[PDB]
């Protein structure tokens, strides 16, 4: 019978019993016991074991009783716009903040960017991965904003700098940027402010409209569906 709980280094099952295939949180490792070769699936995480049929069976370990990848859902902030694409920064990967520490208060008083202080010029490049407050970056091309009429899309009629956007990962890209898409009904703008971030919050009214409550002014966005 299969184990109920797992820790790193714990053997789960052999390859046959049905052909077993390692999923997330598991690995296949060679073992030598009593002078004979052995194959087994080994857990790599602390959690619980569940197997689903996909005969071929996939064995996975799920934490409980990260790093963005293709197919993931992310929450981003718009940084720059042009005629061909939008630049964003990733704030959360599947309802988990990324990074844990955003670096607030590290540069003193005022309103400063993460790399806009004195410590940015003295970071040890060769002894670490990145500096305090750095995030993953992504790019949304105009042809990826929607699935239809992807040759007449106007970027400034869809997003504005400072908006919060829900997107999905398409590719790992290069070492600088991921590639993202919003071409689905549940992807798009979730939070926005009037007067390009100087006013109050707006609420979604239609598939392509948001409204300011204090003064009944309207702007054009690509609204993600609420509820």
């Amino acid at each position: 019978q299969f184990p109920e709980i797992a820790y790193p280094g714990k053997l789960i099952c052999p390859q046959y019993g049905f052909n077993y295939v390692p999923g997330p949180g598991t690995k296949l490792i060679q073992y030598e016991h009593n002078g004979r070769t052995l194959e087994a699936i080994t857990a790599t995480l602390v959690g619980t074991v569940r197997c689903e049929e996909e005969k071929n069976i996939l064995v996975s370990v799920l934490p409980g009783t990260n790093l963005p990848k293709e197919g993931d859902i992310v929450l981003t902030r718009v940084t720059r716009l042009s005629l061909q694409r939008a630049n964003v920064e990733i704030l959360a990967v599947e309802d988990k903040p990324s990074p844990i520490d955003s670096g607030i208060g590290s540069n003193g008083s005022g309103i400063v960017a993460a790399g806009g202080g004195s410590g940015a010029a003295t970071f040890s490049v060769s002894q670490a991965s990145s500096d305090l407050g750095e995030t993953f970056r992504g790019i949304i091309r105009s042809q990826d904003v929607r699935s239809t009429d992807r040759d007449r899309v106007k970027v400034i009629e869809c997003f504005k700098p400072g908006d919060i956007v829900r997107a999905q990962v398409l590719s790992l890209g290069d070492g600088t940027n991921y590639y993202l898409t919003t071409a689905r009904n549940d992807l798009g703008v979730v939070f926005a402010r009037a007067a390009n971030g100087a006013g109050g919050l707006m609420y979604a009214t239609d598939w392509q409209m948001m409204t300011s409550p204090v003064t009944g002014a309207t702007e054009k966005r690509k609204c993600a569906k609420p509820f």
Partner: protein, 305 residues
Amino acid sequence: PITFPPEVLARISPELSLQRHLSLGIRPCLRKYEEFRDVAIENNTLSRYADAGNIDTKNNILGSNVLKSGKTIVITSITGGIIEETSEDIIANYASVYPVVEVERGRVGACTDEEMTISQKLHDSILHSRILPKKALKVKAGVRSAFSVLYPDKRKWSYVLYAKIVVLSRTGPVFDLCWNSLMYALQSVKLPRAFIDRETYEIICDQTKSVPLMINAKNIAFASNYGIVELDPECQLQNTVLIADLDTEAEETSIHSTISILAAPSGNYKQLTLMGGGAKITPEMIKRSLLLSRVRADDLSTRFN
């Protein structure tokens, strides 16, 4: 319904989170408006005189303190040096301590703005509070002759004090915690006795004998901070408020009017900082902050041993 976890909401829209929490009478840190965090300390456990009968001989630490407040931990240690001194209530008759502050946030490199400003402000506030007189650091050196040392019940020397402060698990501004930890560590410092054997005179510290550090005990003060927020009608769930002991990401990102106080249990004040970059600051809020800081200092002074 579409819903975000509290950490995600604080990351993506801190102002809305703060406005929503306040309309219910609570804070994103899950406290009341005028409620402080609890404090627990552990004095003089890392020093070379921690055990009165068994003195460590490989330890050069003269005083120590460990402080815990919420989830934040502060460790303070004090060392010493000696300098040859060649050549009222006025500030020319007072000394200070030289601190170095490290806040662990996952970075390797030189100091940030936060660490440098905190160190400088600690030094300056120690100097301005008239806590450490210059005559309290004068060395009464002895002489060793055939070998024994005779102390007096030429040249002149003075003590020099250094401090090292390490902050772990930071969640907000940490100046008050560092100041309070250093105040606790200063009241437990012992100074080693010193003796002597173009000229070369070498002064040597005694291995086990020491004398206590004499400071103005009536000038000791304790720190607290406050914030002022203006309520937004469209964000309230189904006028200004005063908030004490700011913490967590949502509060530090959205609040730009703050008050800082150093208050002594005698009844006077040693420091006051007003910075209005947000809501308007009125005299009533200043008076309320002064009263609250007085109560907090009274609590922190008479709480241990």
